[PDB]
């Protein structure tokens, strides 16, 4: 129950699971926390303890704005922080099988949160049942979201961007110093993340510092191109400056702006992100990656089309109704409440919201290529085209060039596509299969019995904890003993893909084919 780390030894403690123990060490800290001077700072590493750290509860969450829209809804409030809030979060998690395994391969999670928000102790970021069933050890950390890992100043250091970015290396070195002692082995790591954590986890494929850090990954709705992702430095320093006027900080010294900032508490910073942007949509990342020449050093559109990254095997997914759950959140005419039937001068008022500094034309573009109905009657014609203008263009498209242009370059590259709407979910059913509602599948949530899943369910997630597992330990996200279907690889040519769901597992090809063609070649060009 005692592991000696490089800086001092931790206390973990223990979990029953499915008849057997999980041994958990929940906020272990890897770096100092930024505060004071340290804010907005790289992280700077762990100076060693001599106790035992107790690292039996999750530790703060970092600090950020919460949602606020669906208070006591629950299908909203799974997604909030469960932890105090404070700039003291620097803080990881292990879970290990018990007993110690000997060289177990390791699983870091990056959550996601536009950046803006997130925390590594949600329930279903629960590593413990990775853990019993697939006895790999799984990591996650908590990392700076908002402004206070973000803001950028590119070239100073004391602001010099992408802060969140080095606080998740930062951790993945902790893993390569310290993993072995807890029976992992650290030359088999494969980084995970969903949303901005797998945008986070693409871009670690980009960064030369994280190269010799983790061996695979695993990108779940997000990556790097997608148009959210990465801001450029010269809206990035446009939005440093407009928070620094919006709490009087605005000096010339650039630096004096910092040591202002630096002096403002952290609730102050939160409440003015929301505003440094000229017009924001519920997709909005205020504070996100920069190319800071550190970290990333070149625009990373550049570096995939000319194949400078990590060679290595990747697995790339998405979610039917990735858009659905953003439409509640502005959209007019839409209301988790009803079935949001809109009509077409509401479509086009939630294209306006959706795309706000984009041409007339371009809007009429997104509307005419995605208003040829099949069926001129039905009346979810414009909802359901909405969602997925959104889910194309923010999340699937993105994805689905990304595996592309990552296999063109040699590397084996697998890529599916969830589409089982769970039993039991708080959200109506017109959202459908929502974004981030695989997770708790990953994660082997329905695998407790005890629960609102059902068989079905479970066998679902059975076979993706083993299928993930498999890519982690082997390269190679196969079921191999239950006569499923087997996974192709996916090509630039082909393009299969393997769906996920609990009737029928079917290999298919060219996934959203007419619309990301429309994305990815005529829109970037409005
Ligand atoms: C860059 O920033 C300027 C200034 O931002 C404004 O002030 C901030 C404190 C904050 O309150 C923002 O929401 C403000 O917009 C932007 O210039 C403004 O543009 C908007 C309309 O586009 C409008 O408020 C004013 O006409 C402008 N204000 C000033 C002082 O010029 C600018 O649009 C931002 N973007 C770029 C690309 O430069
Ligand atoms: C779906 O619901 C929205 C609004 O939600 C509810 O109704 C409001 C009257 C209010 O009590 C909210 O707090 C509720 O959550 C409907 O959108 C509204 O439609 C009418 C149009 O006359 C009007 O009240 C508002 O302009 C709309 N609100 C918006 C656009 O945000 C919508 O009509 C409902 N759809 C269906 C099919 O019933
Ligand atoms: N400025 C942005 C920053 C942001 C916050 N969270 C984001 C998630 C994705 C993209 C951006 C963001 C913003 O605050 N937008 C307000 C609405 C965003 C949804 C809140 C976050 N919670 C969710 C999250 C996820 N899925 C959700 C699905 C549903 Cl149905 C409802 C909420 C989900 C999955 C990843 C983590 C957050
Ligand atoms: C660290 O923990 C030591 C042992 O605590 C044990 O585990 C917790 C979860 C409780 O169940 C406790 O009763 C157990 O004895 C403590 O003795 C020690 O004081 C702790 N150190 C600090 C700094 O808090
Ligand atoms: C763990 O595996 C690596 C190769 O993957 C090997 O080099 C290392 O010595 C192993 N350590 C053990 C078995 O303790
Ligand atoms: C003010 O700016 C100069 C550069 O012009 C910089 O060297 C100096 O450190 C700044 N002042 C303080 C107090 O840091
Ligand atoms: C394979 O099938 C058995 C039942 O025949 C089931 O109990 C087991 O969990 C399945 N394994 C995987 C990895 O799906
Ligand atoms: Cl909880």
Same mark, same amino acid.
């Given at each position: 129950?005692?592991?000696?780390?490089?800086?001092?030894?931790?206390?973990?403690?223990?979990?029953?699971?499915?008849?057997?123990?999980?041994?958990?060490?929940?906020?272990?800290?890897?770096?100092?926390?930024?505060?004071?001077?340290?804010?907005?700072?790289?992280?700077?590493?762990?100076?060693?303890?001599?106790?035992?750290?107790?690292?039996?509860?999750?530790?703060?969450?970092?600090?950020?704005?919460?949602?606020?829209?669906?208070?006591?809804?629950?299908?909203?409030?799974?997604?909030?922080?469960?932890?105090?809030?404070?700039?003291?979060?620097?803080?990881?998690?292990?879970?290990?099988?018990?007993?110690?395994?000997?060289?177990?391969?390791?699983?870091?999670?990056?959550?996601?949160?536009?950046?803006?928000?997130?925390?590594?102790?949600?329930?279903?970021?629960?590593?413990?049942?990775?853990?019993?069933?697939?006895?790999?050890?799984?990591?996650?950390?908590?990392?700076?979201?908002?402004?206070?890992?973000?803001?950028?100043?590119?070239?100073?250091?004391?602001?010099?961007?992408?802060?969140?970015?080095?606080?998740?290396?930062?951790?993945?070195?902790?893993?390569?110093?310290?993993?072995?002692?807890?029976? /992992?082995?650290? *030359?088999?790591?494969?980084?995970?993340?969903?949303?901005? +954590? $797998?945008?986070?986890? &693409?871009?670690?494929?980009? %960064?030369?510092?994280?190269?010799?850090?983790?061996?695979?990954?695993?990108?779940?709705?997000?990556?790097?191109?997608?148009?959210?992702?990465?801001?450029?430095?010269?809206?990035?320093?446009?939005?440093?400056?407009?928070?620094?006027?919006?709490?009087?900080?605005?000096?010339?010294?650039?630096?004096?702006?910092?040591?202002?900032?630096?002096?403002?508490?952290?609730?102050?910073?939160?409440?003015?992100?929301?505003?440094?942007?000229?017009?924001?949509?519920?997709?909005?990342?205020?504070?996100?990656?920069?190319?800071?020449?550190?970290?990333?050093?070149?625009?990373?559109?550049?570096?995939?089309?000319?194949?400078?990254?990590?060679?290595?095997?990747?697995?790339? /997914?998405?979610? *039917?109704?990735?858009?659905?759950?953003?439409?509640?959140? +502005? $959209?007019?005419?839409? &209301?988790?409440?009803?079935? %949001?039937?809109?009509?077409?001068?509401?479509?086009?008022?939630?294209?306006?919201?959706?795309?706000?500094?984009?041409?007339?034309?371009?809007?009429?573009?997104?509307?005419?290529?995605?208003?040829?109905?099949?069926?001129?009657?039905?009346?979810?014609?414009?909802?359901?085209?909405?969602?997925?203008?959104?889910?194309?263009?923010?999340?699937?498209?993105?994805?689905?060039?990304?595996?592309?242009?990552?296999?063109?370059?040699?590397?084996?590259?697998?890529?599916?596509?969830?589409?089982?709407?769970?039993?039991?979910?708080?959200?109506?059913?017109?959202?459908?299969?929502?974004?981030?509602?695989?997770?708790?599948?990953?994660?082997?949530?329905?695998?407790?019995?005890?629960?609102?899943?059902?068989?079905?369910?479970?066998?679902?997630?059975?076979?993706?904890?083993?299928?993930?597992?498999?890519?982690?330990?082997?390269?190679?996200?196969?079921?191999?003993?239950?006569?499923?279907?087997?996974?192709?690889?996916?090509?630039?040519?082909?393009?299969?893909?393997?769906?996920?769901?609990?009737?029928?597992?079917?290999?298919?090809?060219?996934?959203?084919?007419?619309?990301?063609?429309?994305?990815?070649?005529?829109?970037?060009?409005?």
């Amino acid at each position: 129950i005692i592991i000696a780390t490089k800086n001092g030894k931790v206390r973990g403690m223990q979990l029953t699971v499915f008849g057997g123990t999980v041994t958990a060490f929940l906020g272990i800290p890897y770096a100092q926390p930024p505060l004071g001077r340290l804010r907005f700072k790289k992280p700077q590493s762990l100076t060693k303890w001599s106790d035992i750290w107790n690292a039996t509860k999750y530790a703060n969450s970092c600090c950020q704005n919460i949602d606020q829209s669906f208070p006591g809804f629950h299908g909203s409030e799974m997604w909030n922080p469960n932890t105090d809030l404070s700039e003291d979060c620097l803080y990881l998690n292990v879970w290990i099988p018990a007993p110690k395994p000997k060289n177990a391969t390791v699983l870091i999670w990056i959550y996601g949160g536009g950046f803006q928000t997130g925390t590594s102790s949600l329930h279903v970021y629960d590593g413990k049942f990775l853990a019993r069933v697939e006895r790999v050890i799984v990591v996650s950390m908590n990392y700076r979201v908002g402004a206070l890992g973000f803001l950028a100043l590119p070239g100073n250091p004391e602001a010099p961007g992408n802060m969140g970015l080095f606080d998740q290396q930062l951790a993945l070195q902790w893993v390569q110093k310290n993993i072995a002692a807890f029976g /992992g082995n650290p *030359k088999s790591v494969t980084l995970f993340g969903e949303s901005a +954590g $797998a945008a986070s986890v &693409s871009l670690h494929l980009l %960064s030369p510092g994280s190269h010799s850090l983790f061996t695979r990954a695993i990108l779940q709705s997000g990556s790097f191109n997608a148009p959210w992702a990465v801001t450029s430095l010269y809206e990035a320093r446009n939005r440093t400056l407009n928070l620094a006027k919006l709490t009087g900080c605005s000096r010339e010294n650039e630096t004096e702006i910092i040591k202002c900032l630096r002096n403002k508490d952290p609730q102050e910073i939160l409440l003015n992100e929301a505003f440094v942007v000229p017009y924001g949509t519920p997709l909005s990342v205020n504070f996100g990656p920069t190319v800071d020449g550190d970290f990333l050093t070149d625009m990373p559109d550049i570096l995939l089309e000319l194949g400078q990254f990590k060679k290595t095997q990747i697995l790339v /997914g998405v979610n *039917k109704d990735e858009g659905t759950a953003f439409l509640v959140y +502005g $959209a007019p005419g839409f &209301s988790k409440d009803n079935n %949001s039937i809109i009509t077409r001068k509401e479509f086009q008022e939630g294209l306006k919201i959706f795309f706000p500094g984009v041409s007339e034309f371009g809007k009429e573009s997104i509307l005419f290529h995605y208003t040829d109905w099949v069926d001129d009657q039905r009346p979810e014609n414009y909802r359901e085209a909405l969602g997925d203008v959104v889910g194309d263009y923010n999340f699937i498209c993105p994805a689905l060039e990304f595996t592309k242009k990552f296999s063109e370059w040699g590397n084996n590259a697998f890529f599916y596509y969830f589409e089982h709407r769970s039993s039991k979910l708080p959200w109506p059913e017109w959202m459908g299969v929502m974004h981030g509602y695989e997770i708790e599948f990953v994660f082997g949530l329905p695998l407790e019995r005890r629960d609102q899943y059902t068989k079905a369910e479970e066998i679902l997630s059975r076979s993706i904890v083993k299928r993930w597992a498999n890519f982690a330990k082997y390269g190679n996200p196969q079921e191999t003993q239950n006569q499923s279907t087997s996974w192709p690889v996916f090509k630039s040519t082909e393009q299969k893909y393997l769906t996920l769901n609990t009737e029928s597992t079917r290999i298919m090809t060219k996934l959203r084919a007419q619309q990301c063609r429309f994305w990815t070649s005529f829109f970037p060009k409005v």
